[PDB]
RNA sequence: AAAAAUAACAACAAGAUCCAGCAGCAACGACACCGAACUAC
């Protein structure tokens, strides 16, 4: 009901391997892969696995362009 | 003492530049973080044990064609963060670009389009250099420093060249070219490194593929290390060792006062 | 969850393929066309994926008036 | 919804050039459309949908009076 | 829920007490709470304004008033 | 939910420790607990703050409060 | 339990590893974690703190962890 | 090339002008804005469509007396949005201001009332010029460029003025409005559009109703394109026709570089 | 003060949220309420007065052009 | 020193518990009983002499103005 | 200030992106729009007031000439 | 002056030991011998001469 | 009327220019005084009653060899006085500065070195400019307005000059001779005469011996009339006609509303 | 009032002597004394850098002057 | 104007007491007053020293010195 | 305790209550302070 778009895009971009870039509401533009994610939580990778949350995330804009089924 | 040494040399194809000596020369001489360009295979090329080398960290963002391009980087401590691609078409697509952020420095490592195949590539150089000047124009506001390896595949000045008169038609040196590499360093701000601790002639980085060149030295500076002003005062030393020879370019070696620490 | 105006502005904002302009909360501008719009995200196609979470979205400034349903 | 239904409704009904201010600060000078449960359509020169998230305050430029 | 929210605004509101509330991004807005509903108050001091509680701070109201 | 959020206020409540709540714009207040609730935190300053928990970063006790 | 960042935060808890939450606002809080639930995450450094969890922008550990 | 012609003009009555034939000598001018100060109608009189041009926007905020004053705006394309208000009790009471956005650029069709009819209307317009100082002070932060295509009724300079040892009393040039006019383009930095593109004299944009003081020339500069120093780069050429008079005052049609764009 | 007052009464004309970092590292946030020639007010909720000696910056949160 | 002067004597005839924080980071307590060039006299049960060209800032603690 | 006001002036009117370091260690950069006897405008996205009392060194990111 | 050298004054006259608080920190022991209009001598265990613009605060031993 | 024409032609040596008419040319443009520089002739050649025009006075410093520099100046009336001094070894030495006096009024021949010839002589433009910008801060003090007819051999703007892009490395157009020349034309509160009637680019006066440049029009502008800031307001017109040229530079003529007296 | 400042300054300036200034922060810089003045002075370990006396600590030379 | 500075730093100067100089830092040098002024101190050692005045927090010698 | 110097004043009744808004800062100087002396940011 309110993930029919928001976790099947997420999925797509984990699987690939794809490096995603996240805006945080703050405006800053953090890098790296999407290693993991849930309802209110995403696991980046890069250097060193970090964690963000999904009420501080504004866009996540795909480095390479994404097939999403 | 405190110093900070950056190696910078385009091998155009790092299988090549490896059978003929650059991994062991590399692993032998000192240095922090080896910004080579490009690649010329995929980031699983460069995953090879092959091509890692002991003692440094490897990271890759390779091109959609291995062979069109890629870039890769060579850091002895782990960064504290690597970013893909600068956004373009043209640099996102080819893999021409691949920074990695320290605690405040930040070493880039950009490959800019030869030119020299085609009118197309020379189109897609010019375009490439119309939003790279827009990006830097962008970038110069934040705080943090940075120190692009770029291979701008274009001449400075005159001095940067023996003979500019008959290059006058030759690519990498036309008028718009020098027009926007001199933009980059003016208004802008972006000073230089090799032009700036040691403003004597006869240094160039590239050289024609004829061996006859080389013997004459016809060779013009394309691989650069553009860094914000904030570090020109950083800048201790430079060198074109060119007796290696490891592919068309040149290595170009730097040692600066700045001590990265992640 | 029964949105008598998102939902159905959206679904003409998208249809219709208008070149709808989102303001975000942070205070940055997003151009390009609705590609999908959920209950918590937006795809909007500006040559890209990109996704906007809805909460990080303060106006959807359309680009031409649009008919509403 | 007790207060803020009939005081949007009194206001789209008036018509009384509203000022949204935003919690960016940033200021929209419209009237109401039309509103719901997370969305307030403005009326200048275009219908500009406004999220009730992210809506500060609505300053009625004009006296109100409350049904 | 809500349980001392309610009965908080209530003696403001029935005391005439002027309140400044403060509002996320810092401003101010000083006047009396005319009325309030799940997620709106009426402040009239210049203007009849809505402010919306998930803006909303702190509300000083600048005197010990406590049922 | 709240298994936590309730001892460490419902504490620092019955034992009135001076608390310092960090809001999300930057500034800081101080004072004393009198009531929470659910959705809102009132303080016991000089005058009854009432600050609300959607706009409040951090709550640090000036008091190593137990957390039992 | 049935998520990502209940086990994540648990074994934080678990290592003791220092972790450097960043806010919303763009400040940052060193100091590891001693325990969490719902919209809190407690942080022992120098003094106790309590985090909002919704006032928090990420979770950054300062050494790599396996969940 | 990008050429943006701005047409302000003070109809005294939209009767008037539209007896005399503005609206057609008005359309047959290229113009990508035209700003109607003192329109003396309700915006329901307005929606006549024989003010409405062909490819132009009707836009207008009337006052609470409709006679009392009133201003209007066309564009060509549809503007970013409307902001019919200003803040004042006397600018929300009498409709004198109405501005229009654009890309970087927001048109603003100001009025001043003239007080030449008596001591209240002096003291109203005292009043506005003492608020209008504040309104520009806080208007003096914002990025975007502002362009008040205004009838200030307030002549600044002898240039402005012939035989100004005569006009020293008559309302609308003494000591307080010019010290102000002077304060607001010299202290704030809104330089104005005549004396950047001609500093030159005789340039009178008001004449009586007397016959005499027009064949002798007679005349004052009342309308004014204020231009925050943003634009005043932009200024290219700006002359006042005053063969096509359609009211009291005349066109004062001024063209900039500057390019608008939804 | 050829400088420093037409900058200081400047952002007390036009009330600049300034953030003023002092000599030992510390940051302070307000509008400047009336500077003097040794001490400087802040318009913060208590008004805190700041000695000119111990301050090493003062930047504002806008641009700020000097009159 | 033209608010100086007035608004340190306000803070002394009400008696008004301020905070001064000194430029090494340690803050003292108590109310300010008199003051003088380059010297505040701070006086709650105990009395200390605390150099101005060492305070960093004043906090009021009470709302007081001039 | 023989040397401190014609120093300031030449990397003034040449813009150059100068780096103060204050006392307590942190380092500020940008150009000097203007300055005065106690105070110096630094312009770098913000045009920030920093105090001559509290400037510790005062390095030109490029050699300046006298 | 109408302060720091009366209160000098009586804490030299009375004998009281001070404790002179450092901007650095430290807290230094010993009577007020004699002071001057920049150096106050604290003479207890050994001679000092502790600067004033060093000097954050100067609190008594006892009421004076 | 009050009318006073200042022409300053540059001429590369006052030979080449009398025997392309450059004599002749002046005595039939009216003007007051005629500011010709780079005469490259001692006194004794200039006090030859060839050069010496019919109503114009004669006035000339040279350095100690007569093709080392020198400069010359006429007047319609005997100045009150005339000063061949500046009090610096780039000035004295090579006779690039004579001042002439009317009523609180005075005007300057100012000769900057080309700096092209060499290194030797950028370095020695460089450290006139050093001491020229200090010698303006210690004259804003007197009160008479001054007229420097300066051969600044810089170009101040981009309109000063066409194909900047190429021209960013070219002696006569770098970073720090932009700097000083905003400098005396920002701070110091001076402003240029030509630039204040026509804000308009291809208005050159200076263009190489190659014609290629002189059908392209491609060419600078190393002629200036810096005025006080007092005489700002008697800018009455500025002209540069190209086609009655006598040397690389061409005459730079400017008419003011002021009147010169004995 | 610099009777032994001025002097000693003068002497390691024009000795051209590698005198290291320690600050009040506890930084060692280091540099020869290009030309100093009553409120600033300048060193030129790389490029010429303005130290200010108020938080100039002890200028210790290399060599014994 | 002072009348206790100078005569001490006379005398700490001509009896030659091993000096002690505690800066407002929070270090420590040793060394004989060679010379004094009213802005700088000359201190012996391998290398002689300049210490400014407004960073010396104390002057200890290592005995006791009776003023004159 | 002293303008390395006013090509020169038809003249001194007189000096000791909220940005119609940036394709967005790998993160804000790490948040408003959390009381016997030890010499690189």
Same mark, same amino acid.
């Given at each position: 009901?309110? !993930?029919?778009?928001?976790?099947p895009?997420?999925?797509?971009?984990?699987? &690939?391997?794809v490096?995603?870039?996240?805006?945080?509401?703050?405006?800053?533009?953090?890098?790296?892969?999407?290693?993991?994610?849930?309802?209110?939580?995403?696991?980046?990778?890069?250097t060193?696995?970090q964690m963000?949350? @999904?009420?501080?995330?504004?866009?996540?804009?795909?480095?390479?362009p994404?097939?999403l089924? | 003492?405190?110093?900070?040494?950056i190696?910078?040399?385009?091998?155009?194809g790092?299988?090549?530049?490896?059978?003929?000596?650059?991994?062991?020369?590399?692993?032998?001489?000192?240095?922090?973080?080896?910004?080579?360009?490009?690649?010329?295979?995929?980031?699983?090329?460069?995953?090879?044990?092959?091509?890692?080398?002991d003692?440094?960290?490897?990271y890759?963002c390779?091109?959609?064609?291995?062979?069109?391009?890629?870039?890769?980087?060579?850091?002895?401590?782990?960064?504290?963060?690597?970013?893909?691609?600068?956004?373009?078409?043209?640099?996102?697509?080819?893999?021409?670009?691949?920074?990695?952020d320290?605690?405040?420095?930040?070493?880039?490592?950009?490959?800019?389009?030869?030119?020299?195949?085609?009118?197309?590539?020379?189109?897609? @150089?010019? @375009?490439?250099?119309?939003?790279?000047?827009?990006?830097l124009?962008?970038?110069?506001?934040?705080?943090? &420093?940075?120190?692009?390896?770029?291979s701008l595949?274009?001449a !400075?000045? @005159?001095?940067?060249?023996?003979?500019?008169?008959?290059?006058?038609?030759?690519?990498?040196?036309?008028?718009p070219?020098?027009?926007?590499?001199?933009?980059?360093?003016?208004?802008?701000?972006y000073?230089?490194?090799?032009? &700036?601790?040691?403003?004597?002639?006869?240094?160039?980085?590239?050289?024609?593929?004829?061996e006859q060149?080389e013997?004459?030295?016809?060779?013009?500076?394309?691989?650069?290390?553009?860094?914000?002003?904030?570090?020109?005062?950083?800048?201790?030393?430079?060198?074109?060792?060119?007796?290696?020879?490891?592919?068309? !370019?040149?290595?170009?070696?730097?040692?600066?006062?700045?001590?990265?620490?992640?």
């Amino acid at each position: 009901k309110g !993930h029919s778009l928001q976790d099947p895009y997420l999925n797509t971009l984990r699987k &690939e391997r794809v490096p995603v870039s996240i805006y945080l509401v703050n405006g800053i533009k953090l890098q790296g892969q999407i290693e993991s994610f849930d309802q209110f939580v995403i696991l980046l990778k890069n250097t060193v696995s970090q964690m963000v949350y @999904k009420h501080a995330i504004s866009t996540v804009v795909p480095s390479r362009p994404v097939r999403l089924p | 003492g405190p110093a900070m040494r950056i190696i910078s040399v385009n091998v155009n194809g790092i299988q090549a530049a490896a059978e003929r000596g650059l991994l062991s020369w590399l692993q032998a001489q000192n240095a922090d973080v080896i910004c080579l360009q490009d690649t010329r295979a995929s980031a699983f090329d460069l995953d090879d044990p092959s091509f890692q080398l002991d003692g440094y960290f490897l990271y890759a963002c390779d091109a959609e064609l291995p062979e069109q391009g890629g870039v890769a980087l060579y850091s002895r401590l782990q960064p504290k963060a690597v970013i893909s691609g600068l956004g373009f078409e043209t640099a996102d697509r080819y893999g021409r670009y691949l920074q990695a952020d320290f605690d405040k420095v930040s070493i880039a490592t950009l490959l800019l389009p030869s030119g020299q195949s085609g009118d197309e590539s020379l189109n897609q @150089k010019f @375009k490439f250099m119309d939003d790279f000047t827009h990006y830097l124009s962008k970038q110069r506001r934040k705080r943090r &420093e940075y120190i692009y390896c770029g291979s701008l595949y274009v001449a !400075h000045q @005159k001095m940067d060249v023996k003979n500019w008169r008959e290059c006058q038609q030759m690519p990498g040196f036309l008028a718009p070219e020098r027009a926007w590499l001199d933009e980059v360093f003016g208004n802008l701000g972006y000073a230089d490194a090799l032009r &700036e601790v040691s403003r004597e002639g006869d240094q160039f980085s590239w050289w024609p593929d004829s061996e006859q060149a080389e013997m004459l030295n016809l060779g013009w500076r394309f691989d650069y290390q553009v860094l914000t002003p904030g570090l020109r005062r950083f800048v201790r030393n430079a060198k074109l060792p060119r007796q290696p020879r490891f592919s068309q !370019h040149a290595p170009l070696i730097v040692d600066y006062d700045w001590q990265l620490s992640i």
